[PDB]
Amino acid sequence: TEITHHQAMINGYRMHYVTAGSGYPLVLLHGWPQSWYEWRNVIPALAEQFTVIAPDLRGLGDSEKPMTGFDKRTMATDVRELVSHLGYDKVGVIGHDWGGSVAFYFAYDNRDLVERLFILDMIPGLIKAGDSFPIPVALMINHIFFHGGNPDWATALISKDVNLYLRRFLTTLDYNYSPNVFSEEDIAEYVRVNSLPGSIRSGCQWYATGLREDTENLAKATDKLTIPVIAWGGSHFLGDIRPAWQEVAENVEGGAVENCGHFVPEEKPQFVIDTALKFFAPLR
Amino acid sequence: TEITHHQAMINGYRMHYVTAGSGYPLVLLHGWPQSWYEWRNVIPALAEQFTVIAPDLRGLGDSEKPMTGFDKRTMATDVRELVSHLGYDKVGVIGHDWGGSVAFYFAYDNRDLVERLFILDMIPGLIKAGDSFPIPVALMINHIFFHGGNPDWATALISKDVNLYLRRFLTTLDYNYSPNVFSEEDIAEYVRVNSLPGSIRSGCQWYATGLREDTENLAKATDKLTIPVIAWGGSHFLGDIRPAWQEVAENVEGGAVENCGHFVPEEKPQFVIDTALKFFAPLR
Amino acid sequence: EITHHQAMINGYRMHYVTAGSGYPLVLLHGWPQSWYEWRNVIPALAEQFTVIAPDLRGLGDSEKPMTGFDKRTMATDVRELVSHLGYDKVGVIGHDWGGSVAFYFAYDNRDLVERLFILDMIPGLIKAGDSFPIPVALMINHIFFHGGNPDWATALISKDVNLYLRRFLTTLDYNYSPNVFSEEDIAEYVRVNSLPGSIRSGCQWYATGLREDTENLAKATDKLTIPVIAWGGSHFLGDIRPAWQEVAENVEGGAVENCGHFVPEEKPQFVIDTALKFFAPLR
Amino acid sequence: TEITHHQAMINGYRMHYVTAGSGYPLVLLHGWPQSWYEWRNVIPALAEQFTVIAPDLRGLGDSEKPMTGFDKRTMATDVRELVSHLGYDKVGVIGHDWGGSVAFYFAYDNRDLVERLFILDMIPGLIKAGDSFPIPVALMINHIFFHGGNPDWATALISKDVNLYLRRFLTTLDYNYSPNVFSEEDIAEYVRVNSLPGSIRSGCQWYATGLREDTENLAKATDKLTIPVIAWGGSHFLGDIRPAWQEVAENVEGGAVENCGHFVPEEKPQFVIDTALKFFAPLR
Amino acid sequence: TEITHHQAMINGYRMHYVTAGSGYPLVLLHGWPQSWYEWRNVIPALAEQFTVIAPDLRGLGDSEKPMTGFDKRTMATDVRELVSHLGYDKVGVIGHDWGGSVAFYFAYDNRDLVERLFILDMIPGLIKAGDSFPIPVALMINHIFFHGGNPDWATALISKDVNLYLRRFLTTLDYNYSPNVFSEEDIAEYVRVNSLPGSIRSGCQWYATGLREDTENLAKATDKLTIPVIAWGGSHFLGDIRPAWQEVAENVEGGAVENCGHFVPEEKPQFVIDTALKFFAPLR
Amino acid sequence: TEITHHQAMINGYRMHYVTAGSGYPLVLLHGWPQSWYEWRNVIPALAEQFTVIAPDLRGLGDSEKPMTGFDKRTMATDVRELVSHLGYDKVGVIGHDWGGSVAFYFAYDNRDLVERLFILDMIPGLIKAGDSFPIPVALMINHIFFHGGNPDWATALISKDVNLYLRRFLTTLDYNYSPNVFSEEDIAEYVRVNSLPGSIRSGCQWYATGLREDTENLAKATDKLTIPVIAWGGSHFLGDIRPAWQEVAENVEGGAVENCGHFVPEEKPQFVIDTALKFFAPLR
Amino acid sequence: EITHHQAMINGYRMHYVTAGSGYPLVLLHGWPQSWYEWRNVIPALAEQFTVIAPDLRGLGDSEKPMTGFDKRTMATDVRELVSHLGYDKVGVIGHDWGGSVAFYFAYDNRDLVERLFILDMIPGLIKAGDSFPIPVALMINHIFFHGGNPDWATALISKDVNLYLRRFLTTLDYNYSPNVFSEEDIAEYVRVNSLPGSIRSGCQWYATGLREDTENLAKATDKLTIPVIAWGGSHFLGDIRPAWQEVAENVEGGAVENCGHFVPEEKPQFVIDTALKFFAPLR
C-alpha cells in the first residue's frame, strides 16, 4: 500500500503520477491549487482493496506544463492516455474541484472506460454558454474572474507571493470549516508546486478555458451519463451538489458533508475513504 | 483661468478639490483609478465660461480615506456637503466611471440641486439586486469581482506593485483605443495617489459596495430623473450607453465617441470640452 | 506624424502606428523591441510612403495570445493587418525576428510583397537536421536560455526586466556603441516587456525558433523571386547576403561600418537612405 | 561509519572534504549544483569496507572560491593534492556529473595513482573543439549556454533566487525519474552552499571553461585509459554512456540504471553502493 | 544672490551649510524631515539685503551623523560654533519646526549673540517634564511617540521605504493646506538625504531627546528672552502660536498664516520673505 | 543544571542574562556576532560544580541597545554591576572573542573581584594607539574596518541580509575547522538576535570603539594582571595566544586547541568544559 | 564633440570615447567611475588636443574579464589601445586608480608617455612589507571591505548600488560640497556599476591593490625622468607632491582649495587650466 512516484509521456509532455495497491483501478483527480498530494490521507486505505492512480493534471503539481489544452475535455484525454498506458480498459474515478470537471468529460467521452464516478465539491462545469451568474455566486467564487479574466495579469499578481495567495483558499473560513485543515508543511508542499515556473500560468488557463471553451462544451453535453454517480460537497462550500449532477446523469446519490469545507479529502478523509470503499465495492 | 488646490472638512474627513474660472458652476467627478487630475485637459476650456469644481472623491486622490461610506449614495452626500460649502444651490455635473454613479445618486437625492447631468463611459450601477451577469460582461469587467469580492486580499496583491497593476487599465487595448493616452508622468501621478496608504483599500470598498448595497439602492431607484441627461460611452469600451440611462431618466441623448476607449476625458478631451460647453450653455 | 491604432487580428487586438501617404511600407520589429525601434526612420519614410509599423504577436502593447508564435503564424497576422488596411501590394522591412516574419510573409504571399529589406538577421536560426558550431552557440547563447525552458527563463528575466534588456541594449558585443539608447528609450522597452505576457510571448518566439521554425525553414526551398536586400552590422552578423542568397534569387546588401545589431537605432540615416532608394520604383 | 568534516590548504585555497571508514581509499567527486552531500546515502555503506574521501570541489559546497582554475584538469590537480596530503599513492574514484570530467583528468594525468574509475551520468566532456551541438542536444542541456555563455549575467539572474533556480535540476521530470528524490531539507542544503558568495560565480566558470579550455583539452587527450572503467547513466538522462567512455578508455563496462534520472547517487543509492563494492572489491 | 555649498568641522563632525549675499547675517534653521533645502525659495530674496546662512543640522541633510548630542540645547551649540567659524558675534535667526526649538536654545543660551528670533510653526518644546498630553494633541502629533518611543524600531520600519513614509508629512491634508506644496523632484531631494545611512537614526534621536532631556530643559528654561520674537504658525497646523511663545519671551508678536499648513517656507515663501525683511530691517 | 532566563536594570538598560547551577560563580562573556547562546553546550556541565552566569552584553542578544558606552572598559562596568546585583564579591570569568577583551578590562579594573581568567581565541585588544597594521593582518581581519570605519553604512549593508552576512563567520573555513559547527537552527538564533533593531548598530559600535577608544585604553593598560590567566586559541584561527596575553599578564598558561577555529565553545565544547573544570577547581 | 568607440584589447572589448585633434592626451578614470568623469574637461582639451578616455578593464561599459586587474596589467590595456589608434607619443592624466594605472603605463613605456598629470592618487595604496597606521586604515576603510573577501563585498554592494556609491559621491569626507553630482550623473555611475561583472571587477581592483600591486610598487625603484604634476584636493589627499617625488625626479604640484577627491567633477576649470599649461609644450 506504499506510494511510488512515476512519470510517462502523455500527449507530448511528462506527466507525474503516483500508484499504490492492487486489484481494480481507481483514478483520483485533484483540483486547483493542488496535486496528487491532496489524496495522501485517502490512498493508503483505498490501496488495501484497489489499485490507486493519482496523476498531477496538465500544468499543475510536478507535471510538465504545456501552453495549451487546458479545456477539461483535452485534460480528460491525458487521463485516458494514462489509463490505457497502465493497461486498463475499465476504471472507477474520484474527482475533486477541477478534477471533478475533468472526471465528467473523462466519463462523458469514454462510456466504454469509466464504470463509476465519485465527485467531491464541484459542479459539472462553472456555467453553460448563454447563461448568467447570479450576484451571490459571482461573489462566492470571485476568484474564477480574476484567474480566468486576464490570466497573464492574474499570474503576475499571484506569482509575486504564492505563499500569501494560496492561503486565501487553504486557511480561510469561507473555504474551510476549520482554518487548521493544513499543517504549515502541507501548505509549503502546495506552495512548492505552484511556485514551479508555469504552474500559476497553467492554473489561470484552467479558469480561462473554464469561462470560455468549457462553457460551450457544457451546453453541448446533453447526453446524460448512465453509470452510477455520487456527488458530495462540503456543508461550508458548495453544499448539496447532488441536484447539479442529476442534470448530467440519470443515477446520482449524494448530499453535503456536515461541518466540512471545500477540501473534503483533507478536512474529512475518513468520509472519502468510507464513501469510496462502499461506492466502488461492486467493481472489486 | 488657472487651477487652485483647496481642501474642506466634509462628513468627518478632509476632502481635496481644485477650482478654476467663474460663472455658473460645473462639478466634475472622477472614477477609479483616478482623481481630479483626469479632468486636467478639460478644466482650462470649461473655466473660460464656467466655475469648475473637481474634487478627489472619498478615499482616492489626496482626499483622506475613512473606513466606510463608500456606497455611491453616501459619497454623493460628500459632493452635496462640498457644493453647500462653496455657496451653490444649483449646479451642472459631469461624471466619468464611478464618478458617473456618484453623480446619478447626487442628481436622484437632490432634485432641486442638480440641473443637468453629463455621463462618460458608465452605467447608473454595475447591476441591480436580483439580476445576473452574462459571461461576456463578467469577462469584460472581471476586475469588479477581484476588487469587490474579498477587498483585503485584492488590496494586498495590488499594493505589492501599484505601478504594474494600474497599467492593466491605463495602457491596454481593451480599455483605450491608443495605448499612449498617458505619458509616464501622468501614470506616475495616478501611481502616487494610489500608493498613499488607504487609496487601494478605499478603491476596493468602491467595488465591494458596488456589488452589495449599491445594487439594492439601484433596484429601488425607479423614480426617473426629469433633468436633461447626456451619456457618451467610448466606441472601444461601453459604446452607446443611452439605453442604460433611459431606464433611470426621462430625457436622455448622446451615443458613442468614435475611436475612443474608456478614459474619454484624456483620450478625447476636445470631444468632452465641445459637448460640455453646448450641453451646459443653457444654465449660464 | 505618427498615429496610434488598434485592429482585431486573428483573434487578438494588434497595436500598430501609421504615418505618411502613397505606397505602403511595413516595418517589422524584433526582440526585445516594438514599433518604437523605427521611431527615427518613420518620419523620413513618411514623406514619400505610407508607413505601417505594428507591435507583432505578444510584444510591445499588442495583446498576448498563448500560441501562434511560430514565424509563419505571425506572418498571417501581418497579412490580415495589410488586408484590413485595404492594400494588395506592400514593401516590407524586417529587423531581427521581424526579418524572419518578413521572410515567411513574402514566402507565403508571392503576389502581395514586392520588395524585402532585411536588417541584421538570417532567414531562421537553423534548419531541422543541422547543428550549432560552438563559437555560434556562445555568440547567441541567449536563444537556448529563452527557447530551452521558456517558463524558467520567463521567471528569471521577469524578476528584473530593466537589468536583463541591457544584456542586448548597452553591451559592446551587440552594439558598436554602448550609448545607442537614451535611458528614456530603454525605459520604453522595459515598459512594454514588463506588461504581463510580453516576456512569456518573447520566450515563445525563441522556443518555436528552435522547434517548428526549423522544420518550416528546412522546407522553404522555393527561392523568393522579388528583390531582396540584406544588411547586417559590422559588429554583429555583418555581410548577411550569403544566407539570404539561399532563400532568394535576387540579393544585394552587405555590412554597415561601425554598427551593431540595432541598425534602425544605431544607424537611422543608413536605413532611411537605403530604403528610399530600394523602394523608389514602387511609388 | 561516522562522517567527519575536514579542511586542507590545496593549491592556494581552503578545500572542505569529509572522510569515513577504513581500508583502501575511494575518492567520491560531486558535480553541479551539489557537494560532498550528494554521497551522504552511499558513504556509510562504502565506509564498512573502504576509506571514503568526498571533497567540495573548487568554488562549490563550503570550499573556498578562487577566481581562476575552473578547467577540469586544474580541478583534478586539487584532487591530486588532497590525496597526496592524506598520504595515499593508490585510489579508486567515483565521479558524478562534472565530477566525472574531473575524475577523467585525474585518471588521465595520474596513471600510477588512480587504479579504477566509476562514472555516473557524465560524458568525458560536453563536446570536442571543432564539433557542433545537434539541436535536440542543445535543447536537452540548454543551461550550459546560459551558465557558460555570459557567466556574470547568468550569475546575476541565478543569484536573485537560488531556491527557484536549483529546482530546474532537483525536482523536474526531465532531470529525475521521480520529482521527489530530494526532501525540502536536502534542497535547502544545496541552496545554502550555492547562496555562499562566489558559489554561483564559480559554478558558472565550471561551464564557461566547459565550453572553451576543456573542449581543447579533450581533443588533445588522445591516450586512452588502460585501467578498468565502469560508466552508468540514468534511463531518464544520459542512459547508456559506455560508447562515450569507449572513446577515452580501452576497458569500459556499465549501461543504464532503470527508472533513474541524472542524480544517480541520491535517486538510486543502493545501485551505486552495490556497483562500487563489487567493482572496487579487488583493491581491498 | 547665489547659494554656495560649504562644510566646516563643528563639535567633532563635518557640518554642511549654504551661504548667499552680504550684510547683517540671518541663520535659517530647518526641521524634520528636511534640510537647508526647505529655505531654497526664501534665501535668494533675503540675500538681496542680508548674509544668509542655512546649515544642515546634526545628523540630517548631508551633515555627518554622530550617535549622541541630539537634545536641542546641544544642537544649538553646533549653530554657535558655526556662527563663530564664520566670524559673526551678532545674528538674526529664523527657526522652523525643530529648527525653532534649536533656535530657542540658541537665543536662550547666547543672549549677546541672537538679536531677533522668527519662529515658523513650532512651540518652544513638545512639552515640560511633569505635564501630560491631551488625547487630541497625542493623535494630532502621534509621529512623536513613534520616532522617539523606541528609535531603533521606528528607524527599521521608516528606513524600509523612506519615499512612502516622508509623504505622511509632505503631501497630506493634515500637514499642508494643498497636497501639492512639493513637486516629485523636491520630495526626491528629501528622500535622498533621509536615505543617507544615519539620517533616520539621527531623526528619531531628535524625537527621543524631544520626549526626555528636552522636557527637563524646558521645565527649567524659565528666564524669558528679552529680544524681539515673532512666532507665526500655519492656519491648517499650529495656527496662533503666540501664547506658547509668550511663556518664554517678554516681546512676542505674530499669529496665523491663512490657508497654510505646517511647511510655511515652501507653501507660503513670500509670507516668510516679507515678514523676515520687515522684522530684521532694524539690523542693517 | 536547567538554564533560567533573567533581566536586571544595569547602567540604565535592561540586560538579559541566564543562570544555572550553584556554588562559586563563573561569568561567561560572549563575543560578536553571538550571545549567551554560544555557551549553551558548556553551561550544563559547569553548572554541576558552579553557579554559571552568561549575560547578553550591551546592544547584543536580547539585551537593550543604548546609543553609547560600547568601549570595552564601559561594557566591563556593566558586568561589574551585574555581578554586584547578583551579590558576589569574588568571580571567575571566561571570555571569547570580544567577551575576552571585556573580560580583560573587568579583571584589569577590578583587581579584588576577578580571581581567575580563561580567554578563548581573543587578544587583549585589536591594537595599541600609535601602532600600525601589517597588510596580511589587515586582510585577515578586513571586517573590523568595514564594521568600524563608517558604522552607519556597514549597518545599512549588513541589515539588508543578516542571514547571509553572519555566514561570513559561522560557516566559513577561515573562521572554522569544520563548516558544520552550527545547525540551521543555531544560525537562525544568531540571525534572530542580530535582526533585532539596534543589534547591528551596536555590533558596529563594538568595532568602532575597538579601533578608537580601545586603542587608547590598551596603550595605557601596562599594569599587568597578577591573577592566574589561561589563554587558548583555535589552531585554525589565532592559535597559541599565550604571548599576546603575557604582554598584559604575569601568569599565563594555555596554547592552541587542535583542529579548531574561532568558535571554541561551539566547535570544541568538551575542551572548554574540561579546561574550565580544572582551572576553576581551586576557587570552589 | 565626443564619439563612442570600441576595440579588442588583450582579449576583451574596451569602450572608449575620443574628441578633438592634434597631440593625443589619455584620460584614465578611477573607481567607482568611467570615461564619464572627464566629460566637463574633454570639451576644452579637444580644442587643442586629441582626447582619449577609455573605460578601464571591468568598469563602465568595457567588457569584464575574471583576471588581470593589477595596475601593471591594466596599463598594458592602455598601451594596446594607444597603439591601435597609432600614437608613438602621449600625454596622460590619471585620477584615483587611473593615476596608479597611469604610473605603470609611464614606468613600463619610457618613450611612449612624455608627460603625466596625477589627480588625488598616490603611486599605490602601500608597498609590500609596510603597515597602515590606524587613522589611515580608518580614512580608507573601504579598501579592506572591497579587497579582503571580494565575493562577500560584491554581494553586499550589488544588493543596492544606488545607496553604496553615495558613500563616495555625496559625502562631506570625499567632497568639499555634497552637490558635485546631479541625480542624473549619479544614475550614470549606478548604471555602469549595475552591469553584471562591474562590482566583481571593481572589488578585484582593490584585491590586487592590497596584494600584487604592493609587490610591483616595492620593485618600482627606477624614478620616472619625464615631467610629472600631481594635485590632490584640499579636502582629501591634499599635497601629493612628496608621494610622487618618491617615484619621479621632476614633480610639481600641491593642493586644490575647497576641493574633495573628485577633482575632474568638483573643479573642472582647475583641471582644464592645469592640463592646457602642462601639455602646451607637446602641441
PDB file of C-alpha atoms in Angstrom, chain E residues 37-144:
ATOM      1  CA  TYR E  37      16.621  72.905   1.049  1.00  0.00           C
ATOM      2  CA  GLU E  38      13.306  73.987   2.719  1.00  0.00           C
ATOM      3  CA  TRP E  39      14.694  77.621   2.560  1.00  0.00           C
ATOM      4  CA  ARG E  40      15.585  77.462  -1.154  1.00  0.00           C
ATOM      5  CA  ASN E  41      12.684  79.865  -2.148  1.00  0.00           C
ATOM      6  CA  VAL E  42      13.393  82.298   0.766  1.00  0.00           C
ATOM      7  CA  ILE E  43      17.234  82.533   0.582  1.00  0.00           C
ATOM      8  CA  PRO E  44      17.618  84.467  -2.773  1.00  0.00           C
ATOM      9  CA  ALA E  45      15.202  87.320  -1.813  1.00  0.00           C
ATOM     10  CA  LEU E  46      16.714  87.506   1.781  1.00  0.00           C
ATOM     11  CA  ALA E  47      20.188  87.591   0.110  1.00  0.00           C
ATOM     12  CA  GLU E  48      19.492  90.895  -1.754  1.00  0.00           C
ATOM     13  CA  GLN E  49      19.593  92.524   1.756  1.00  0.00           C
ATOM     14  CA  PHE E  50      21.436  90.157   4.203  1.00  0.00           C
ATOM     15  CA  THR E  51      24.108  87.450   4.533  1.00  0.00           C
ATOM     16  CA  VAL E  52      22.017  84.208   4.554  1.00  0.00           C
ATOM     17  CA  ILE E  53      23.474  81.102   6.351  1.00  0.00           C
ATOM     18  CA  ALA E  54      21.434  77.829   6.184  1.00  0.00           C
ATOM     19  CA  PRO E  55      23.045  74.700   7.686  1.00  0.00           C
ATOM     20  CA  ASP E  56      22.130  71.015   7.723  1.00  0.00           C
ATOM     21  CA  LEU E  57      21.590  70.425  11.468  1.00  0.00           C
ATOM     22  CA  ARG E  58      23.193  67.466  13.287  1.00  0.00           C
ATOM     23  CA  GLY E  59      22.579  64.060  11.549  1.00  0.00           C
ATOM     24  CA  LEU E  60      20.121  65.443   8.941  1.00  0.00           C
ATOM     25  CA  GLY E  61      20.611  66.597   5.317  1.00  0.00           C
ATOM     26  CA  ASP E  62      24.219  65.999   4.084  1.00  0.00           C
ATOM     27  CA  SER E  63      25.727  66.904   7.545  1.00  0.00           C
ATOM     28  CA  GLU E  64      27.664  63.998   9.209  1.00  0.00           C
ATOM     29  CA  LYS E  65      25.696  61.987  11.780  1.00  0.00           C
ATOM     30  CA  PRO E  66      27.073  61.479  15.330  1.00  0.00           C
ATOM     31  CA  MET E  67      25.490  58.883  17.731  1.00  0.00           C
ATOM     32  CA  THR E  68      24.792  61.426  20.571  1.00  0.00           C
ATOM     33  CA  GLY E  69      24.016  65.120  21.171  1.00  0.00           C
ATOM     34  CA  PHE E  70      20.521  65.365  19.618  1.00  0.00           C
ATOM     35  CA  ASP E  71      18.967  67.302  22.563  1.00  0.00           C
ATOM     36  CA  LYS E  72      18.145  70.792  21.240  1.00  0.00           C
ATOM     37  CA  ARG E  73      20.462  72.560  23.801  1.00  0.00           C
ATOM     38  CA  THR E  74      23.451  70.617  22.289  1.00  0.00           C
ATOM     39  CA  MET E  75      22.376  71.172  18.616  1.00  0.00           C
ATOM     40  CA  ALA E  76      22.177  74.975  19.437  1.00  0.00           C
ATOM     41  CA  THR E  77      25.976  74.734  20.395  1.00  0.00           C
ATOM     42  CA  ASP E  78      26.722  73.478  16.759  1.00  0.00           C
ATOM     43  CA  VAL E  79      24.979  76.651  15.444  1.00  0.00           C
ATOM     44  CA  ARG E  80      27.089  78.794  17.886  1.00  0.00           C
ATOM     45  CA  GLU E  81      30.359  77.101  16.684  1.00  0.00           C
ATOM     46  CA  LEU E  82      29.238  77.751  13.020  1.00  0.00           C
ATOM     47  CA  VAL E  83      28.410  81.470  13.630  1.00  0.00           C
ATOM     48  CA  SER E  84      31.837  81.632  15.412  1.00  0.00           C
ATOM     49  CA  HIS E  85      33.700  79.894  12.498  1.00  0.00           C
ATOM     50  CA  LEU E  86      32.282  82.496  10.010  1.00  0.00           C
ATOM     51  CA  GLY E  87      33.336  85.378  12.363  1.00  0.00           C
ATOM     52  CA  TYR E  88      29.970  86.992  13.439  1.00  0.00           C
ATOM     53  CA  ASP E  89      29.124  87.988  17.069  1.00  0.00           C
ATOM     54  CA  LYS E  90      25.612  89.359  16.089  1.00  0.00           C
ATOM     55  CA  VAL E  91      22.951  87.399  14.090  1.00  0.00           C
ATOM     56  CA  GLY E  92      19.237  87.132  13.450  1.00  0.00           C
ATOM     57  CA  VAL E  93      17.681  83.625  13.341  1.00  0.00           C
ATOM     58  CA  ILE E  94      14.662  82.041  11.593  1.00  0.00           C
ATOM     59  CA  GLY E  95      13.675  78.606  13.035  1.00  0.00           C
ATOM     60  CA  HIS E  96      11.038  76.255  11.546  1.00  0.00           C
ATOM     61  CA  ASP E  97       9.760  73.018  13.226  1.00  0.00           C
ATOM     62  CA  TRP E  98      12.599  71.548  15.378  1.00  0.00           C
ATOM     63  CA  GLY E  99      14.811  74.329  13.987  1.00  0.00           C
ATOM     64  CA  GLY E 100      12.565  76.587  16.129  1.00  0.00           C
ATOM     65  CA  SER E 101      13.339  74.526  19.284  1.00  0.00           C
ATOM     66  CA  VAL E 102      17.095  74.701  18.454  1.00  0.00           C
ATOM     67  CA  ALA E 103      16.713  78.441  17.632  1.00  0.00           C
ATOM     68  CA  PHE E 104      15.132  78.814  21.115  1.00  0.00           C
ATOM     69  CA  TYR E 105      18.195  77.270  22.911  1.00  0.00           C
ATOM     70  CA  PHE E 106      20.500  79.291  20.567  1.00  0.00           C
ATOM     71  CA  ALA E 107      18.850  82.571  21.823  1.00  0.00           C
ATOM     72  CA  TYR E 108      18.350  81.294  25.429  1.00  0.00           C
ATOM     73  CA  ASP E 109      21.978  80.076  25.925  1.00  0.00           C
ATOM     74  CA  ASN E 110      23.729  83.018  23.976  1.00  0.00           C
ATOM     75  CA  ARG E 111      21.886  86.312  24.880  1.00  0.00           C
ATOM     76  CA  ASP E 112      24.514  88.773  23.496  1.00  0.00           C
ATOM     77  CA  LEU E 113      24.624  86.842  20.125  1.00  0.00           C
ATOM     78  CA  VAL E 114      20.982  86.362  18.852  1.00  0.00           C
ATOM     79  CA  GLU E 115      19.386  89.851  18.352  1.00  0.00           C
ATOM     80  CA  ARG E 116      15.927  88.839  16.881  1.00  0.00           C
ATOM     81  CA  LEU E 117      14.088  85.453  16.644  1.00  0.00           C
ATOM     82  CA  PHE E 118      11.470  84.415  13.990  1.00  0.00           C
ATOM     83  CA  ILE E 119       9.624  81.085  14.698  1.00  0.00           C
ATOM     84  CA  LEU E 120       7.632  79.236  11.999  1.00  0.00           C
ATOM     85  CA  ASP E 121       5.023  76.638  13.115  1.00  0.00           C
ATOM     86  CA  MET E 122       6.756  75.338  16.315  1.00  0.00           C
ATOM     87  CA  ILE E 123       6.372  75.651  20.173  1.00  0.00           C
ATOM     88  CA  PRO E 124       9.489  76.073  22.381  1.00  0.00           C
ATOM     89  CA  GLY E 125       9.411  72.324  23.197  1.00  0.00           C
ATOM     90  CA  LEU E 126       6.967  69.375  22.697  1.00  0.00           C
ATOM     91  CA  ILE E 127       6.191  69.546  26.494  1.00  0.00           C
ATOM     92  CA  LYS E 128       7.658  70.254  30.036  1.00  0.00           C
ATOM     93  CA  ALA E 129       8.507  67.367  32.443  1.00  0.00           C
ATOM     94  CA  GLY E 130       5.577  66.782  34.847  1.00  0.00           C
ATOM     95  CA  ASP E 131       2.878  67.702  32.273  1.00  0.00           C
ATOM     96  CA  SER E 132       0.637  65.261  30.327  1.00  0.00           C
ATOM     97  CA  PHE E 133      -0.655  65.018  26.662  1.00  0.00           C
ATOM     98  CA  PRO E 134      -4.415  65.571  25.946  1.00  0.00           C
ATOM     99  CA  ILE E 135      -5.811  62.853  23.586  1.00  0.00           C
ATOM    100  CA  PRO E 136      -6.402  65.435  20.742  1.00  0.00           C
ATOM    101  CA  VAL E 137      -2.711  66.605  20.919  1.00  0.00           C
ATOM    102  CA  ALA E 138      -1.449  62.929  21.110  1.00  0.00           C
ATOM    103  CA  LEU E 139      -3.450  61.971  17.927  1.00  0.00           C
ATOM    104  CA  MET E 140      -2.557  65.276  16.083  1.00  0.00           C
ATOM    105  CA  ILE E 141       1.257  64.606  16.624  1.00  0.00           C
ATOM    106  CA  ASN E 142       1.297  60.734  17.046  1.00  0.00           C
ATOM    107  CA  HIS E 143       4.523  60.531  14.918  1.00  0.00           C
ATOM    108  CA  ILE E 144       6.465  61.933  18.005  1.00  0.00           C
TER     109      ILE E 144
END
